[PDB]
Amino acid sequence: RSVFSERTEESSAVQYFQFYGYLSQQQNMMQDYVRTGTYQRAILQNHTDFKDKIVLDVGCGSGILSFFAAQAGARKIYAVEASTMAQHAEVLVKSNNLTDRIVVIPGKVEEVSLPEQVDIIISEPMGYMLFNERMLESYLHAKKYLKPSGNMFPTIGDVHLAPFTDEQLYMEQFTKANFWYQPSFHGVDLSALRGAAVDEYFRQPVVDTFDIRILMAKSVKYTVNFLEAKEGDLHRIEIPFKFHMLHSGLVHGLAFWFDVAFIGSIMTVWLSTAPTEPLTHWYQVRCLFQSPLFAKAGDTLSGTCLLIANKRQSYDISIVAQVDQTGSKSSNLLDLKNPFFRYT
Amino acid sequence: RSVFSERTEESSAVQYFQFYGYLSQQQNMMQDYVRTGTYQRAILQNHTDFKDKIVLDVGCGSGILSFFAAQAGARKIYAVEASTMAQHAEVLVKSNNLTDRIVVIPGKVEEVSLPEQVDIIISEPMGYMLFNERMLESYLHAKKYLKPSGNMFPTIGDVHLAPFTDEQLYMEQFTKANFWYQPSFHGVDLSALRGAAVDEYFRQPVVDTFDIRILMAKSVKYTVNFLEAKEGDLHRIEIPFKFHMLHSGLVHGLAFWFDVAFIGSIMTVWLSTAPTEPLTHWYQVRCLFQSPLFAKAGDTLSGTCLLIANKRQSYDISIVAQVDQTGSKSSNLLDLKNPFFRYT
Amino acid sequence: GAIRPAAPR
Amino acid sequence: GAIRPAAPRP
Ligand SMILES: Nc1ncnc2c1ncn2[C@@H]1O[C@H](C[C@@H](N)CC[C@H](N)C(=O)O)[C@@H](O)[C@H]1O
Ligand SMILES: Nc1ncnc2c1ncn2[C@@H]1O[C@H](C[C@@H](N)CC[C@H](N)C(=O)O)[C@@H](O)[C@H]1O
Numbered sequence: 001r002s003v004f005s006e007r008t009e010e011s012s013a014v015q016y017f018q019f020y021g022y023l024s025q026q027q028n029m030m031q032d033y034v035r036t037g038t039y040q041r042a043i044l045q046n047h048t049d050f051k052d053k054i055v056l057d058v059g060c061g062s063g064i065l066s067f068f069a070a071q072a073g074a075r076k077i078y079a080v081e082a083s084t085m086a087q088h089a090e091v092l093v094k095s096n097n098l099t100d101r102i103v104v105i106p107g108k109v110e111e112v113s114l115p116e117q118v119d120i121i122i123s124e125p126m127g128y129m130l131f132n133e134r135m136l137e138s139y140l141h142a143k144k145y146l147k148p149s150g151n152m153f154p155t156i157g158d159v160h161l162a163p164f165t166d167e168q169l170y171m172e173q174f175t176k177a178n179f180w181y182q183p184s185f186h187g188v189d190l191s192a193l194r195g196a197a198v199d200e201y202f203r204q205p206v207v208d209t210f211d212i213r214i215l216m217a218k219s220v221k222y223t224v225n226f227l228e229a230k231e232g233d234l235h236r237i238e239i240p241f242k243f244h245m246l247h248s249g250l251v252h253g254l255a256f257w258f259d260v261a262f263i264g265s266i267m268t269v270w271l272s273t274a275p276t277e278p279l280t281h282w283y284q285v286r287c288l289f290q291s292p293l294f295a296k297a298g299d300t301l302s303g304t305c306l307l308i309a310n311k312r313q314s315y316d317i318s319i320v321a322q323v324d325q326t327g328s329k330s331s332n333l334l335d336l337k338n339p340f341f342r343y344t
Numbered sequence: 345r346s347v348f349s350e351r352t353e354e355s356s357a358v359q360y361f362q363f364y365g366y367l368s369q370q371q372n373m374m375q376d377y378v379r380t381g382t383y384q385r386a387i388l389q390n391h392t393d394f395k396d397k398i399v400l401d402v403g404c405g406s407g408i409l410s411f412f413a414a415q416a417g418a419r420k421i422y423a424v425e426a427s428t429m430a431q432h433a434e435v436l437v438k439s440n441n442l443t444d445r446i447v448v449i450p451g452k453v454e455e456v457s458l459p460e461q462v463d464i465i466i467s468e469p470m471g472y473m474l475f476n477e478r479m480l481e482s483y484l485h486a487k488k489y490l491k492p493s494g495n496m497f498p499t500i501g502d503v504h505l506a507p508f509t510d511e512q513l514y515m516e517q518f519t520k521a522n523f524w525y526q527p528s529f530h531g532v533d534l535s536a537l538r539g540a541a542v543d544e545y546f547r548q549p550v551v552d553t554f555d556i557r558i559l560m561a562k563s564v565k566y567t568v569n570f571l572e573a574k575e576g577d578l579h580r581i582e583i584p585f586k587f588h589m590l591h592s593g594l595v596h597g598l599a600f601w602f603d604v605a606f607i608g609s610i611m612t613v614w615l616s617t618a619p620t621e622p623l624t625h626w627y628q629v630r631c632l633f634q635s636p637l638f639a640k641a642g643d644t645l646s647g648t649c650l651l652i653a654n655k656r657q658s659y660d661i662s663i664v665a666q667v668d669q670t671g672s673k674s675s676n677l678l679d680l681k682n683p684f685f686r687y688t
Numbered sequence: 689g690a691i692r693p694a695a696p697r
Numbered sequence: 698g699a700i701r702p703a704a705p706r707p
Contacts, residue, residue: 011358015698019691023541027523032695040530067532088537095536128693179371186384188411192439193432197367207693281695341693359689363700376704477700551702625704685702689698 003141003231004110007134009311016133016313020083026062029124032281036064038271039124039262042153043068046264049120049151050074058109058123058142059135063089065122066102077101078118082108109142118145122153127314128207129285130159130258131237132336134313136224140231152226154260160274162219163243163251163301163321164286169206170252173288173340177201198290203335205317206286208342212275216251217243217301237307237315245299253288253332254305254319283343289330293323300324312337347485347575348454351478356656360477364427370406373468376625380408382615383468386497387412390608393495394418397463402453402486403479407433409466410446420445422462424486426452453486461491467498471658472551473629474503474602476680478657480568481575496570498604504563504618505585505600507645509593510554513686514632517545542634547679549661550630552686556619560595561587561645581651581659592640597632597676598649598663627687633674637667644668656681 050072057066060079069077086106093102105112125135180197183189220241259272273282303321314337322329394416401410404423413421430450437446449456469479521541524534566583603616617626647665658681666673
């Protein structure tokens with residue numbers, strides 16, 4: 001039936017909205033002060049984008065961003081939430097005396113009916129590596145409700161990519177895989193599964209932070225403009241790259257992070273997940289190469305990061321990289337749905 | 345369509361078998377040396393229950409238990425596995441040159457066909473708190489393939505429950521929930537959801553180990569005899585208790601652990617997850633009381649632990665307890681499928 | 689089913 | 698979605 005159910009396996013959806021149904025999970029996001037306080041700053045400092053305006057909050061969760069919009073003088077805020085968190089949001093709207101201004105609407109933004117078109121859409125639809133969850137697509141879908149020359153908060157998103165060296169990370173993953181190297185595990189030969197094991201462990205993106213000294217080159221930027229993109233733009237995301245290596249050493253994979261910009265009428269406010277910035281609950285993301293690439297300073301490392309949307313609310317990621325000077329290449333598949341959360 | 349599909353929501357099934365399809369997850373179980381080593385000892389030291397016998401391995405995973413049956417001399421072993429781990433097991437059967445003795449059968453044990461009846465069923469289908477996953481029912485279901493006077497390994501399982509005092513663990517729940525008791529979280533009064541947050545945290549069983557000094561009475565035991573039990577016997581599990589209190593204090597809830605016994609022709613081998621025994625990947629499980637109960641040594645703490653099976657492959661737990669000398673009473677409801685993993 | 693990572697202290 | 702906890706570490 002709906003645009004959402006056509007692109008999403010039911011098993012994925014149930015589990016997804018179950019996770020967000022937990023007050024403990026909403027609290028986790030809320031307690032990220034950089035995230036929550038930057039959203040508040042972006043909204044309050046652009047108060048004229050809200051004052052007496054009609055607002056759509058896509059995936060309101062607790063209601064938190066709708067309360068910021070109300071603090072900035074919005075006339076009416078439609079707060080849409082597909083998880084059972086919608087009922088808790090309703091309770092908060094009542095206890096905060098904002099029933100005249102915040103209207104919770106339970107269900108998927110792809111399935112509900114709003115009573116009118118809006119001036120501005122706000123959301124926090126960013127997953128780790130930006131694209132996990134495929135919630136950006138629901139955010140773009142919601143533009144069917146946006147007035148001409150309406151705005152989006154956030155307005156754009158930049159994904160950054162850079163090559164890294166981290167021998168300790170590589171060996172940590174490699175060591176776990178080599179459990180399946182043993183030819184006599186309790187007298188049983190596991191070694192025929194070595195290859196599948198390495199493949200599975202290296203399909204896992206690594207979510208954690210790190211020092212910027214591990215980066216071997218200036219980062220490449222890929223931009224998505226939410227004011228212009230169509231949902232279909234996010235089905236196949238292709239990020240070519242050419243890195244000018246600043247340091248010699250082994251390239252163990254690519255590091256990703258993302259920034260979003262809230263481009264208001266008064267000022268632009270950035271929310272950054274970069275490793276040079278204060279740490280957020282998104283940390284940063286690294287895709288390891290099963291086979292590291294040796295490169296010399298001044299070499300070029302070129303290739304393509306390709307993200308293919310799947311029905312499990314995430315992406316199949318392929319990264320092909322090569323050192324142009326030697327023709328040394330690494331081909332990699334990663335399953336963005338199945339990360340290794342390594343942070344302590 | 346099958347006994348399995350009737351008692352199980354697809355969304356739960358899909359996620360369950362995805363989990364077991366990871367070589368990393370099979371690996372996690374294999375690496376529990378207490379678990380894997382005890383299974384090997386029970387099978388090998390009862391070699392006469394296996395020599396030239398026909399064996400069914402219910403949920404064979406990587407195949408490890410089936411290889412131990414081969415080590416003990418079984419003629420034919422049918423290894424049934426529902427997840428995609430089935431392919432990986434088939435690879436190990438070939439690489440260990442056991443194609444003539446181990447036959448891997450992909451699919452649910454409720455849905456596949458065996459060509460003959462077996463002498464002995466082997467399985468590791470114990471969830472945390474024993475009952476989680478409802479795989480005990482698949483193990484019992486499999487007795488349709490058992491010859492009269494066939495054996496089961498394990499043969500019996502015992503759950504233990506005992507009252508505990510742990511003020512710090514109890515207090516950790518209100519600490520977490522009082523996030524919501526802020527009148528101005530970024531300008532928002534969250535206080536109305538505090539009660540809901542408390543209920544959410546108290547609905548989670550706690551998975552971790554503990555010092556035995558926290559236990560306030562000798563355990564009561566509930567036993568499942570896998571030779572005699574029917575599937576239906578596991579849909580509603582009623583565990584009455586009358587604890588004679590050995591220590592005075594605030595009872596904060598009930599602690600659970602479990603033992604299984606392999607009752608073979610040569611000897612009985614026990615696999616215990618008790619807090620007195622070396623730690624396993626099952627740890628122990630604690631269910632808190634939201635209102636704790638004062639009891640003095642010599643008092644009786646009476647009540648019932650009621651576990652009711654649900655379609656998410658787990659149980660709704662109802663614990664009701666009173667101190668008989670005073671009449672003070674505590675009711676608690678938990679969701680076994682959603683535990684807090686507190687161990688480091 | 690790990691959707692969002694734990695927020696840092 | 699954790700079915701089995703992690704094995705305790707040496
Ligand atoms: N298709 C959808 N329709 C409605 N809500 C959704 C959809 N997809 C995700 N969500 C909700 O969007 C929220 C995403 C959260 N990252 C944001 C929560 C909240 N706005 C906050 O900033 O704290 C979750 O509560 C999800 O349940
Ligand atoms: N109904 C079922 N039919 C077939 N396999 C199942 C069923 N339910 C659970 N399983 C499998 O049973 C296994 C349970 C594991 N605890 C045991 C793995 C393996 N036997 C070992 O001891 O290492 C998983 O691989 C599940 O996929």
